[PDB]
Design a protein around this nucleic acid. Structure first.
Ligand SMILES: [Mg+2]
Ligand SMILES: [Mg+2]
Ligand SMILES: [Mg+2]
Ligand SMILES: [Mg+2]
Ligand SMILES: [Mg+2]
Ligand SMILES: [Mg+2]
Ligand SMILES: [Mg+2]
Ligand SMILES: [Mg+2]
Ligand SMILES: [Mg+2]
Ligand SMILES: [Mg+2]
Ligand SMILES: [Mg+2]
Ligand SMILES: [Mg+2]
Ligand SMILES: [Mg+2]
Ligand SMILES: [Mg+2]
Ligand SMILES: [Mg+2]
Ligand SMILES: [Mg+2]
Ligand SMILES: [Mg+2]
Ligand SMILES: [Mg+2]
Ligand SMILES: [Mg+2]
Ligand SMILES: [Mg+2]
Ligand SMILES: [Mg+2]
Ligand SMILES: [Zn+2]
Lengths: 58, 97, 99, 86, 49, 116, 122, 137
RNA sequence: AAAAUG
RNA sequence: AGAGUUAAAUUAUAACUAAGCUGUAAAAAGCCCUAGUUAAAAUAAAAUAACCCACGAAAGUGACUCUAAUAAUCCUGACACACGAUAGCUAGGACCCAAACUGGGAUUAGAUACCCCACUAUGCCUAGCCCUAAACCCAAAUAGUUACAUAACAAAACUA
């Protein structure tokens, strides 16, 4: 469920201390963010290790 | 002069408000079996509103009861008791997928 | 001369009351490859999925039974002055004019 | 220390599957918030920064939940348009 | 009514004469406050086991 | 200083019949010995209003309010005598003194005989 | 019941527990408090190993002593039970029965807050 | 095949055996996976250290011991030293969050040990000691 | 990581 | 505001194992009276609950228990009275951990800085001072209205 928003921001009618302090106005935009491309990582370091074990032993 | 005009009266189709599972119940610090259903079995954290689904009063009351029982010597803090581990699942959190 | 208060008091929509979990008859007026546009007749047209049983029997003009959920799906969002209208209704399929 | 050991944050391996049991255990900690708690407790954060982090996280969560709600509301209009050409 | 309610409870209080009986009775009559809940909102007791 | 007895059978269980017929066990529980400080505040308010005021029912009156706040001022001074570093209750006592003085000025302006 | 006392006694023999309870209730009465009921919760595993009186305690019997006591005598009983060597953990709280159960009215639906920003055209 | 991920606590009457021993007698592999090192020590159920191997002891160096490869090699050598004393099953206890966390866990399996249980005993102070100041001022 | 001036 | 208590971590302290531990993009310095596991007082702080928005006039407050307790039959109002985060001063006590300053090691042409290690004042308790903050929600207090009406941005425009 969506968190409550009543009495959170600093307004003229709000009597209490503001709770949330938005960096940018909380207006729902008309476009979603572009999907993030995942950061790559090295592959089979585990099998490279057993490959080099033969070379260090033999 | 029209007898078919709408009359300003209360809504008859007003559905009853949803109740938390413990509305009009008694929360206690000695009921470790009840307090254990709202704590994680592996870590011991107290579940939030989005997990339990309790209205505003009983969430604070169950939190205070858990915190009191953890220090009075009735319930462990780090884990949920295996004796009460087999209780029915009330929380809405799913770990194993 | 009949007055609008008088005919609205006897309108079927007034007799239905809330539109939640109400059984209505609708007639299909448009057909998509897999979506059926059913006009239950209240304000808007609902869109339903073609079932697996007797799927060939759903044609244009066919009368079906619906369990109405909402007359018009609207809701409020952040920073919106008014609702976001879906121009549709919510209903589910039960049968096709069982008579 | 005072509690009995091998009860909390323990996952039992099934049929020798260790890689998946570790993923299950990692899911336990991520969904209980322990991983972020450790990464945050590595270095101390001042209360002024803690309040800003809480406010930013709450605003981001509210925006994300509202966007997801609108997306799920508008999923119905994903169907192919039958009035093409009008 | 509250005075009458307490009057009935005054008979079952623990006193010097009742100390020896009450201690032994408590040592032989264990009590449990454990009770759980369900999603429907009903209470379930472990005492039927 | 006033000395309210601990076995006084406090106000909430004083005007009901049959209080003296029950035994000492019930009478002790229904007395000030088992009571908190707010009960003693009510008892002191009652005992001061029965002797200082002329109409105990007229609470909205200036002199009744002055007596009611005098009870609270005495309680606040007693609290101060125990807690020296308490600044919140010190502020409460100092503001109640000003309120009582303001209403005493108003009473002096309106009804002189009652003020004296 | 006004006050409640959650007495965690050391796990020990039946006559020793009887004597400890008798002397504890005698100490409760000597301060001017009437004990209303005595309840035994049974001897279970302690949630954690409690270190008290230079002893590591793993077991312990639970007891519930509800009574009526003046507000002035609450602390002296705590000091007595602290130096009592057969008590693992003394705790005096308010009895849960004196707080009346208010009507837990239910989940009142809260609407989405609106007019948080002006009507400027973005 | 009703299998529960919950631990077999000694308080119950369950019947589970690994190489003829109960869950309470199976040795422990304490694995501290720090941000710059990974230390593995195999102790018995009686808290007697059997095998100890760490990336520093594996002939590594300052920054090369922080990688997951050093953790895997340390796990392999710790597994070899454990098998030297005749052990079959062990319970892994992971301490700390680091890069050599999963790699040194799988190192025991690569070196010839069967992992039956993994317990995350990570230090989580409930706002106890104040940690050091944040970097990048 | 680093890294000034016109 | 007082009084009492501690669940996790940390440490002074003992026992087994190892020759390394810490440290960063990489190193060096430091510690090898070092490190891992099993037990362990004192001090400091108070995970999740909190997607909660309550209390207090403000500063401020969210580990537990008990006591006292949160002015005004409720307008505004000072240079008068009382408070007033952190930082700083005095006396006594405490010191796990963090850290101004300082001393070493990195980088740089220089680095009396950002990076690493150690430590002091200090952060902790009682008593007495100091009376300062981007003490800001930069929006004064009290009762109101959605009438006329967008310099711009931002939290809409306004009355007595
Ligand atoms: Mg306020
Ligand atoms: Mg901004
Ligand atoms: Mg933006
Ligand atoms: Mg700065
Ligand atoms: Mg120049
Ligand atoms: Mg103090
Ligand atoms: Mg401890
Ligand atoms: Mg010391
Ligand atoms: Mg060196
Ligand atoms: Mg805490
Ligand atoms: Mg008030
Ligand atoms: Mg004024
Ligand atoms: Mg100050
Ligand atoms: Mg200071
Ligand atoms: Mg110091
Ligand atoms: Mg330091
Ligand atoms: Mg230097
Ligand atoms: Mg401020
Ligand atoms: Mg200003
Ligand atoms: Mg003003
Ligand atoms: Mg413009
Ligand atoms: Zn409820």
């Amino acid at each position: 469920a969506t968190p409550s928003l009543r009495g959170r921001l600093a307004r003229l009618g709000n009597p209490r201390r503001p709770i949330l302090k938005p960096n940018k106005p909380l207006i729902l935009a008309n476009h979603v963010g572009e999907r993030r491309r995942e950061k790559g990582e090295a592959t089979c370091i585990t099998e490279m290790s057993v490959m080099m074990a033969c070379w260090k032993q033999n | 002069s029209n007898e078919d005009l709408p009359v300003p009266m209360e809504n008859p189709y007003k559905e009853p408000l949803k109740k938390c599972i413990l509305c009009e119940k008694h929360v206690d610090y000695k009921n470790v079996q009840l307090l254990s259903q709202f704590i994680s079995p592996f870590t011991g954290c107290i579940y939030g509103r989005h997990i339990t689904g309790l209205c505003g009063k009983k969430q604070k009351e169950i939190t205070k009861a858990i915190k009191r029982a953890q220090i009075l010597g009735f319930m462990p803090v780090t884990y949920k008791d295996p004796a009460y581990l087999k209780d029915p699942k009330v929380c809405n959190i799913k770990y194993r997928e | 001369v009949e007055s609008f208060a008088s005919m609205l008091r006897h309108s079927p929509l007034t007799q239905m009351g809330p539109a939640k979990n109400k059984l209505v008859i609708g007639q299909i007026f448009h057909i998509v490859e897999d979506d059926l546009y059913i006009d239950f007749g209240g304000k808007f047209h609902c869109v339903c999925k073609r079932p697996e049983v007797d799927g060939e029997k759903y044609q244009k003009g066919t009368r079906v039974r619906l369990r109405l959920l909402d007359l018009e799906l609207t809701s409020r969002f952040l920073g919106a002055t008014t609702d976001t209208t879906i121009l549709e209704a919510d209903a589910v399929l039960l049968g096709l004019q069982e008579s | 220390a005072n509690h009995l050991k091998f009860i909390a944050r323990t996952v039992m391996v099934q049929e020798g599957n260790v890689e998946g049991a570790y993923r299950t255990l990692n899911r336990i900690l991520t969904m209980d918030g322990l991983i972020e708690d450790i990464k945050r407790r590595r270095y101390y954060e001042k209360p002024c920064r803690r309040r800003q982090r809480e406010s930013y996280e709450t605003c981001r969560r509210i925006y994300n939940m509202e966007m997801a709600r609108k997306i799920n509301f508008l999923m119905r209009k994903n169907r192919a348009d039958p009035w093409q050409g009008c | 009514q509250e005075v009458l309610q307490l009057q009935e409870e005054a008979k079952t209080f623990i006193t010097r004469e009742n100390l020896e009986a009450r201690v032994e009775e408590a040592l032989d009559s264990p009590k449990s406050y454990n009770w759980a809940i369900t999603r429907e909102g009903l209470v379930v007791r472990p005492q039927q086991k | 200083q006033d000395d309210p007895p601990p076995s006084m059978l406090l106000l909430d269980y004083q005007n009901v019949p049959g209080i003296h017929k029950v035994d000492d066990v019930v009478k002790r529980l229904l007395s000030l010995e088992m009571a908190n400080q707010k009960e003693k505040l009510k008892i002191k308010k009652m005992q001061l209003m029965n002797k200082v005021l002329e109409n105990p029912e007229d609470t909205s009156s200036l002199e009744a309010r002055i007596v009611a706040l005098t009870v609270k001022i005495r309680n606040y001074e007693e609290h101060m005598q125990k807690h020296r570093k308490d600044k919140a209750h010190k502020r409460f006592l100092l503001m109640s003194i000003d309120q009582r003085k303001k209403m005493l000025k108003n009473l002096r302006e309106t009804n002189y005989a009652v003020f004296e | 019941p006004r006050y409640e006392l959650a007495l965690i006694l050391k796990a020990m023999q039946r006559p020793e527990t009887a004597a400890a309870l008798k002397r504890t209730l005698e100490a409760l009465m000597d301060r001017g408090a009437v004990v209303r009921n005595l309840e035994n919760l049974g001897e279970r595993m302690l949630p954690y190993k409690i270190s008290a009186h230079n002893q590591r305690h793993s077991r312990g019997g639970y007891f519930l002593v509800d009574f009526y006591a003046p507000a002035t005598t609450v602390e002296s009983m705590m000091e007595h039970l602290s130096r009592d060597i057969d008590v693992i953990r003394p705790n005096i709280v308010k009895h849960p029965l004196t707080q009346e159960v208010k009507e837990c009215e239910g989940i009142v639906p809260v609407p989405l807050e609106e007019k948080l920003y002006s009507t400027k055209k973005r | 095949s009703s299998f529960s991920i919950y631990p077999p606590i000694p308080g119950q009457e369950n019947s589970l055996r690994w190489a003829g021993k109960k869950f309470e007698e199976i040795p422990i592999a304490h694995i501290k996976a720090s941000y710059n090192n990974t230390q593995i020590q195999v102790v018995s159920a009686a808290h007697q250290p059997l095998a100890h191997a760490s990336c520093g002891t594996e002939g590594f160096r300052n920054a090369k011991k922080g990688t997951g490869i050093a953790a895997q090699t340390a796990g392999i050598a710790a597994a070899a030293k454990a098998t030297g004393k005749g052990v079959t099953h062990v319970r892994v206890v992971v301490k700390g969050l680091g890069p050599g966390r999963l790699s040194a866990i799988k190192g025991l399996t690569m070196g010839g040990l069967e992992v039956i249980s993994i317990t995350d005993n990570t230090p989580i102070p409930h706002n106890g000691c104040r940690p050091r100041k944040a970097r990048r001022l």
